[PDB]
Design a protein around this nucleic acid. Structure first.
Lengths: 157, 357, 359, 356, 157
RNA sequence: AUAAACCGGGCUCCCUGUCGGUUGUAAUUGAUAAUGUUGAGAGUUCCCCGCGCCAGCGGGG
């Protein structure tokens, strides 16, 4: 029912350099639909179910920042979730607050483009399945929560 | 005859930042559920007030301040040839409600508008009152008699005639209440705007800077809808009972300025000196804005300008028919019951002539 | 006489990356709902400021910094034969609002433009004020009485006279506040641009990993104007003709100088294909000629120039612009109607500008 | 005297694939709203640097790498007859900022250019410091006083003198910062190109026929515009203060190479060994490219070549008359105030003689 | 809407002269230069301008041959029949890059290339579904063609 | 026609001035799209008019 995020992650990690190269050339999420290698990548992960397509398009798009741009790290046994996207972006020390500002205010499509730029720039360390859920919904609530996590992190750290 | 005159402007700006807030981000507003970029009414006002067109076709502008010491010295300087120093000081005191020492720091209650012409007139009055050893509250009593005689002076302070003034202290509280004759709206864009950001640096000529964090400046371009109306009667009253012709004159200057003046912010580094591409003037018994023409935000097709102009025109047709608005209207446009005007000057003339030339 | 001089430039660049941000991305902007490539006004300014042409026809650039230690040392070396070190140090300390020790690092509030001529002048004043046991406050109030006398020194810092200066510390707050005479806009393309991407590598000569760079070509619209009166004022009261000469050099530079970025690898050393100069009472930009992004036909250049010419026709007739105007262009096709004098060469244009638009 | 030399080349290649990206697609660019085939400036620079002509006429080229271990071995073997091993290893360690063990793999921060002569000179310096118990710090500050004496070594690394060097570590970070004297553009076709696709197979000599699926390779022909300019003053400075004549010499060699050298890519399979059909050189006080002659993409008539040349000539006339370019100019062409040259050698001589 | 199987049956029973005459075009609009075309497509609402573009495409593909496109009805189990992309993939005669370059091919470039593929592959498919695809033929129908092709090829292997 | 009715929270206000994101970088080496094939047959060509020995001939679309 729910999309496997970790599977897709590892899949993207072990992808052949040519396919990765072919996917890395999209400049917009929907362009992934122009690319054979993409469908081959997401076929095992429920692409054929319309419910999961938009979601998958985002996931891959962000991953398409690089083969190891998004470093996944498991959460600690103690805490209930791992590192959030905002927090990681803030932790990188390379992302300026106004970037997030203009991100959460961006139109559809544009936001994902911007996000991917931020990911290449930061090479964040985060709980990937968490980010994946976030991308799965990606609405007002989530954008806001992103900026909040960023702000509070940058505040303490 | 119609009491109200409506001025609509569609003007398109190249990338720029014509107004910002406490975080130096472009001022915005939500309309139709989408973000428009906004140029506030006060900004437009001050733009027109301090313009050179104003200075050459309307006259002197009010002087807004709170520093009665500085104002003291200024007033002494430009009135010293007509009045005694303490006639001047006295007048200042009676109008401000604060004692005019030779102190170098004297604070009013708030930043208020000072028309110099007005103050000169009050200086004549206070001179009179000084000759007859008259008590202040009685001078007040006399002056409350004929307020029109004081408003006649706002012909050397038209900007207050247009935008009004509220009074809180001194005889102004009784004599100074002006209700503005011009209503003016915050400029908003006819389309959704996602603002761009400029990421700049400063190269230090004495050290090869390496890693650095770049400064940010929000900016955007956009097609703005400006709207203002003028209540002719109230202008006439605010000017001391001036003729309709003089009102219409001032109105015409407001049209010109609303069609040409652009706030000064960051213009030295973004240069958005664009004239308006559409100006329509419309005489009416009840003021009405055309803002709802762009409530459904304009989507671009070969730009935002033309689609905006057409949105405007269509809503104008629908409202004119719907609410039966037979009033003199004229439209000036750069693009190929409303009288079309080839040049801005023809429009201006049309307005001067009460809308039938 | 007209107070404002407007400079419009259409200049076409071959594949390049002449301005980028902290993420190696081309600077862009949205106009008419389509993406234009952008070159920031700062970039143009400093490219002009530091150019060779400026060095040969205007003079020495202002020295912009925030490091008062280095500045101290510099000022010593270039002025030492004229003043005691302590007069120099004191003048710097009074202007900056910081204390000039023999401290290794002494930082101002911000990066400010300094002119050595100006600093010297202040050194004289501080010296006579030293000889008269006059106190710093009174010195300040005295100097405040004749500002022009200080603005004359900006003839050795003309760029400041053009782009201005702000101060937040020291006597400069009262004295060194300059209001720029030249307004200049970001350059944007007249058309939509979807940037290309060069995928590159580096070959290791001892063994047997791809990077990326964004680039694009584009037809750019440069705009600037100069406020003659404010220039004259900012130069101490200089003549209208000296003003016009400086404005002329700005025309030249805006039509020929190009930011240095990525140029050694992309070489976009192109000159302008159209330059129009236009005299005016109220400054106006022609950017709106390209609000409707220019669609290509036989290039972007020709349709951009025609679009320009048309808008200028509409705006000039519509707003009744009677002002001296002249246009230089490398293209042959139909220009602006006869109130716009045509110029075969750039130098004829510049002469026409030097001559208040009558030659 | 004029400080800039502008080199313009029009060269027509036959079906080939002279530069491609990580998906083996031809490199392109958009110019004038149309697609042009492109050859990167790095491709051109490296082709020139590694060419035979450069080895015979200019000499040693830099050794760009990131493997300090391997470089250590190479440097030992190449300098071992002038310095003993420890001086070499120490010098390398100083210039790179890494410790030079006897380790198998010693990485620099990035691939950088190394000039062997330069390194040698540093070895002599380090050695003098060795005999005089001079501290490394003081050594550095001694070296910063006379930089030109370091730059005089770039006559055995002229490609660095032409295309610059940036250092981010070791003493090089203060000493190796080199400002390139040659600016060079990407080559772009003067006309639109829609690339063709070769569909190929690989026949198995032991497999009895059968339907295989075929591979693809993008290719195309095209008339390319090449541009470069040389900042003479900067070349002189970069070589330690060499005369103008040595610089005009180097510039001449660059004219030759830029007119004749073609990148080796896919040439064993496509062989686009074509020589330029036009070469013009132009002396100037401000560098200027002529790419805008082809902004309006060149329409074919009797090929792309002649219209391309014509376009070039007209736009040069316009630019010259409009911007008043009093400057030495000369043009060589294989077709029938700009001095014509019948042969490339005469153009080269005209350049060597400062255009007189 | 346009009756598909009717148009198919009409094409199957057209006279060989008209048939060969139609096949000869090299661009859909050239069908407008042919009488046999008009007589063929008039019973199916050519006279209504809304349906014209569509018809031009459909016939063009059919023009590959009288029996190049083999219709086969969908099985009662399945909700839809064999789409074009699946058919092409099933042929074993089409190369992925042909399909890729097909969906990235411009109005017009596009139909010509498709017809070449059709003659080459002689596909068995649910015709009315193809007809619908041709009725709309926009970015997502093209992208769907690529999807079906790639995914079928991966499935079958 | 209800703790209701009657019943404005209302007047005034630039967020302004200063700022290159800059230096360096081959995508490169290998590769048949190949085997097999009459376009044969067949006078229909839709309308008007003239002539005719009603076999057809001719003029115009």
């Amino acid at each position: 029912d729910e999309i496997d995020a970790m599977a897709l992650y590892r899949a993207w990690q072990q992808l052949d350099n040519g396919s990765c190269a072919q996917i890395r050339r999209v400049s917009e999420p929907d362009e992934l639909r122009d690319i054979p290698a993409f469908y081959r990548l997401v076929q095992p992960f429920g692409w054929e179910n319309p419910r999961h397509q938009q979601a998958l398009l985002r996931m891959v798009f962000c991953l398409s920042a690089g083969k190891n741009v998004i470093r996944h790290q498991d959460k600690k046994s103690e805490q209930t979730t791992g590192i959030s996207l905002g927090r990681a972006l803030a932790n990188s020390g390379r992302i300026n607050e106004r970037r997030i500002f203009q991100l959460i205010r961006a139109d559809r499509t544009a936001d994902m483009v911007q996000l991917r730029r931020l990911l290449t720039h930061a090479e964040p360390v985060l709980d990937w399945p968490l980010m994946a859920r976030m991308l799965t919904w990606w609405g007002k609530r989530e954008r806001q929560q992103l900026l909040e996590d960023f702000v509070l992190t940058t505040n303490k750290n | 005859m119609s009491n109200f005159i409506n001025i609509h402007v569609l003007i398109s700006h190249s990338p720029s930042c014509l107004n910002r807030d406490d975080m130096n981000m472009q001022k915005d507003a939500i309309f139709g559920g989408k973000r428009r970029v906004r140029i506030s009414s006060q900004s437009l006002k001050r733009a027109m007030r301090k313009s050179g067109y104003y200075a050459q076709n309307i006259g002197e502008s009010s002087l807004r301040t709170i520093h009665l010491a500085q104002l003291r010295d200024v007033l002494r300087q430009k009135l010293g040839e007509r009045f005694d120093q303490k006639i001047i000081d006295k007048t200042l005191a009676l109008l401000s409600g604060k004692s005019v020492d030779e102190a170098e720091k004297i604070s009013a209650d708030a930043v208020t508008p000072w028309v110099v012409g007005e103050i000169a007139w009050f200086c004549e009055q206070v001179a009179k009152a000084e000759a007859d050893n008259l008590d202040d509250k009685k001078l007040l009593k006399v002056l409350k008699e004929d307020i029109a005689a004081i408003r006649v002076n706002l012909q050397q302070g038209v900007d207050i005639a247009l935008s009004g003034r509220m009074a809180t202290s001194g005889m102004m509280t009784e004599l100074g209440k002006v209700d503005g004759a011009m209503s003016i709206a915050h400029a908003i864009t006819t389309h959704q705007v996602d603002s761009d950001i400029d990421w700049f640096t400063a190269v230090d000529d004495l050290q090869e800077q390496g890693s650095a964090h770049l400064g940010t400046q929000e900016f955007s371009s956009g097609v703005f809808y400006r709207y203002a109306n003028i209540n002719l009667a109230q202008l006439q009253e605010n000017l001391g009972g001036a003729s309709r012709e003089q009102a219409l004159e001032i109105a015409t200057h407001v049209v010109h300025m609303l069609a040409t003046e652009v706030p000064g912010a960051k213009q030295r580094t973004y240069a958005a000196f664009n004239p308006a591409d559409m100006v329509m003037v419309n005489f009416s018994d009840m003021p009405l804005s055309m803002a709802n023409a762009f409530e459904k935000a304009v989507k671009a097709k070969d730009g935002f300008l033309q689609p905006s102009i057409q949105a405007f025109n269509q809503y104008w047709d629908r409202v004119a028919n719907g609410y039966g608005l037979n009033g003199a209207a004229a439209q000036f446009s750069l693009s190929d019951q409303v009288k079309q005007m080839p040049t801005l000057e023809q429009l201006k003339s049309w307005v001067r002539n009460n809308g039938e030339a």
